[PDB]
Design a binder for this molecule. Structure first.
Ligand SMILES: CNC(=O)Nc1ccc2c(c1)CC[C@@]21OC(=O)N(CC(=O)N(Cc2ccc(F)cc2)[C@@H](C)C(F)(F)F)C1=O
Ligand code: NA
Length: 323
């Protein structure tokens, strides 16, 4: 039996599917099927401060050399005609209470992906909200104060977590994707899960950010590459700053980057240490998005039709059950 439900359990994965299924139960639509949510990878990693920032702040003892975090991979599956169809997947970076500033108590979405075959089509949007709001609610409960989202769609014919998408599933334009996350976060605010949210520029302004060493530094994020480019440009200068370039860049791309406050004011100051109840889950196939993208490209595990998607889901589960 190589079904999604059979995969090992986590406090995180069960919190999410319960939120999804309670929602669907209430909706009581006859075309909906049971959804199952599973964390298929959990490992401890570090994000190393890149050369420019290392020479400016690390070498002077002003900034930590690296930031420890936990990476988790999790996927969601719905029963569509007696069989599991993987319609959502996500990779996250979690920086706990032992992490040095500016990263402590922060979560970041590395990549998120979906296959538009959730049944019915009229309930897709609402189900995506349940998973994402549920993840925010879950980490807030553990004592993570902030969520970070880089709302950016893929490049020219680019695939994130799933191999070969339906040609019908259009790559959203940036303003559509931004509006989507704004709407999900307004809903999380109304449910009293998110205290408030802000764009990166407005957030640094309100935090009185004066140095590049104060900006959260995540694996594969836009801002560590911007700082590198900016330092290179500034070091090339001869005469016969960094923060002002950072503020200008942040203003220019502000709508793309969300800073989500889950815990506000004094409640965020007297928190106990973050204790994750879930154990580490070694699974090389799901350590980052590349290993599953390769296995799916080699074994032709496609998601370009409902039938092709259901097929590749089955294969995915057989591979996940082997380890
Ligand atoms: C040949 N065809 C292709 O390659 N198709 C194709 C289309 C889209 C995308 C990819 C490939 C790769 C990744 C992805 O790119 C992207 O931006 N998203 C999010 C996205 O589309 N949504 C936001 C969303 C969805 C589900 C959630 F749980 C949370 C948030 C929708 C609903 C929106 F945009 F409408 F809000 C993707 O899943
Ligand atoms: Na993404």
């Amino acid at each position: 039996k190589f079904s999604a439900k059979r995969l090992p359990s986590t406090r995180l994965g069960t919190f999410l599917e319960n939120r999804v299924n309670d929602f669907l139960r209430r909706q009581n639509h006859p075309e909906s099927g049971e959804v199952t949510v599973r964390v298929v990878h959990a490992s401890d990693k570090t994000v190393e401060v890149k050369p420019g920032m290392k020479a400016r702040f690390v070498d002077s003892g002003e900034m930590a050399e690296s930031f420890p975090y936990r990476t988790k991979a999790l996927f969601a599956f719905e029963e569509i005609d007696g069989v599991d169809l993987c319609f959502f997947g996500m990779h996250v970076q979690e920086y706990g209470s032992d992490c040095p500033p500016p990263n402590q108590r922060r979560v970041y979405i590395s990549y998120l992906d979906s296959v538009h075959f959730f049944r019915p089509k009229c309930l897709r949007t609402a189900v995506y909200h349940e998973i994402l709001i549920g993840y925010l609610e879950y980490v807030k409960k553990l004592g993570y104060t902030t969520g970070h989202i880089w709302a950016c769609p893929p490049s020219e014919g680019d695939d994130y977590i799933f191999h070969c998408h339906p040609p019908d599933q259009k790559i959203p334009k940036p303003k559509r994707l931004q509006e989507w996350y704004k709407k999900m976060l307004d809903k999380a605010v109304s449910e009293r899960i998110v205290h408030d949210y802000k764009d990166i520029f407005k957030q640094a302004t309100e935090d009185r950010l004066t140095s590049a060493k104060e900006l959260p530094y995540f694996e594969g994020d836009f801002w560590p590459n911007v700082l590198e480019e900016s330092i290179k440009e500034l070091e090339q200068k001869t005469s016969k700053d960094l923060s002002q370039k950072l503020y200008a860049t942040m203003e220019k791309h502000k709508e793309v980057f969300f800073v989500i406050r889950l815990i506000a004011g004094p409640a965020a100051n007297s928190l106990p240490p973050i204790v994750d109840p879930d154990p580490l889950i070694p699974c090389d196939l799901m350590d980052g998005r590349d290993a599953f993208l390769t296995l799916a490209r080699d074994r032709h595990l496609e998601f370009s039709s409902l039938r092709r998607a259901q097929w590749s889901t089955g294969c995915m589960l057989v591979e996940l059950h082997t380890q």
